[PDB]
Ligand binder design. Structure first.
Ligand SMILES: Nc1ncnc2c1ncn2[C@@H]1O[C@H](CSCC[C@H](N)C(=O)O)[C@@H](O)[C@H]1O
Ligand SMILES: [Cl-]
Ligand SMILES: [Cl-]
Ligand SMILES: [Cl-]
Length: 261
């Protein structure tokens, strides 16, 4: 089996306290306390989720550069959608998410560029015909203790996103739930040859998942990138002393309506 599969099994065998220490070991973490305390209480620029910080991390390093019409698949509360709205060359943001019981509904915010954001709930993207976009974002992937179940879920997401990518967005950022399973690596290699990009591990991701982002501004060997992530994750297991996370300031999303080019 792959190193990721080994990681997965060891993760599944962990105790409660061990698991909770491990998931944040040596990760980058946003101080969400201030943002999430404003949940029960929209112009303060506080992001709706920790997802915003992940997208900033990628954009800040030019792994993706949102432009024109942005489509955000599985937008949830809208962390990525509202971040995209603050990008210089973005003109429109369209978010889709399933919502309903047990799932996130879009949160209407008045952060900067809110006037160009529309998010629609009650949309299962596996039945949604594709549309033209300039930037395609997708953050879909339900975790499972089974790598085989995650593999199938990941292949289904990849089949679905291929339709959107064939519409010509040059900028994209797609969550790969289970990048380490053989069938997923195979599909990624064909899609990389077809659409470009590469896989990046965002250090804000918890050690409890192996998610990697397929992004347009990356390049290089997928197998190697996945393997190095597996080894780093396994390397953080069973430490003698837990050092904990490293903290960074949350994203500032500003306020009010925006002009677009
Ligand atoms: N088949 C499907 N169709 C539409 N949305 C789905 C879906 N399966 C899962 N989702 C949604 O996809 C979301 C992924 S989490 C999205 C986080 C977002 N990037 C942010 O920054 O806030 C979840 O809210 C989940 O409800
Ligand atoms: Cl899924
Ligand atoms: Cl702000
Ligand atoms: Cl403006």
């Amino acid at each position: 089996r792959t190193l990721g599969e080994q990681w997965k099994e060891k993760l599944n065998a962990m105790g409660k306290e061990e698991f909770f220490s491990y998931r944040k070991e040596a990760i980058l973490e946003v101080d969400r306390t201030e943002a999430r305390r404003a949940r029960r209480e929209k112009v303060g620029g506080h992001p709706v989720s920790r997802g915003t910080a992940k997208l900033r991390w990628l954009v800040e390093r030019r792994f993706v550069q949102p432009i024109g019409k942005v489509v955000d698949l599985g937008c949830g509360r809208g962390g990525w959608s509202y971040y995209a709205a603050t990008m210089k060359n973005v003109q429109e943001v369209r978010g889709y998410t399933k919502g309903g019981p047990g799932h996130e509904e879009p949160m209407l915010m008045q952060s900067y560029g809110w006037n160009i954001v529309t998010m629609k709930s009650g949309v299962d993207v596996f039945y949604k015909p594709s549309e033209i976009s300039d930037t395609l974002l997708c953050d879909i992937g339900e975790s499972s203790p089974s790598a085989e179940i995650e593999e199938q879920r990941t292949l289904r997401i990849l089949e679905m996103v291929s339709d959107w990518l064939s519409r010509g967005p040059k900028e994209f950022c797609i969550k790969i739930l289970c990048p380490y399973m053989p069938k997923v690596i195979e599909k990624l290699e064909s899609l990389q040859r077809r659409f470009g990009g590469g896989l990046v591990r965002v250090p804000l991701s918890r050690n409890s998942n192996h998610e990697m982002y397929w992004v347009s501004g990356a390049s290089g060997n997928i197998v190697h990138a996945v393997n190095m992530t597996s080894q780093v994750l396994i390397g953080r297991m069973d430490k003698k002393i837990w050092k904990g996370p490293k903290y960074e300031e949350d994203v500032n999303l500003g306020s009010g309506t925006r002009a677009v080019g």
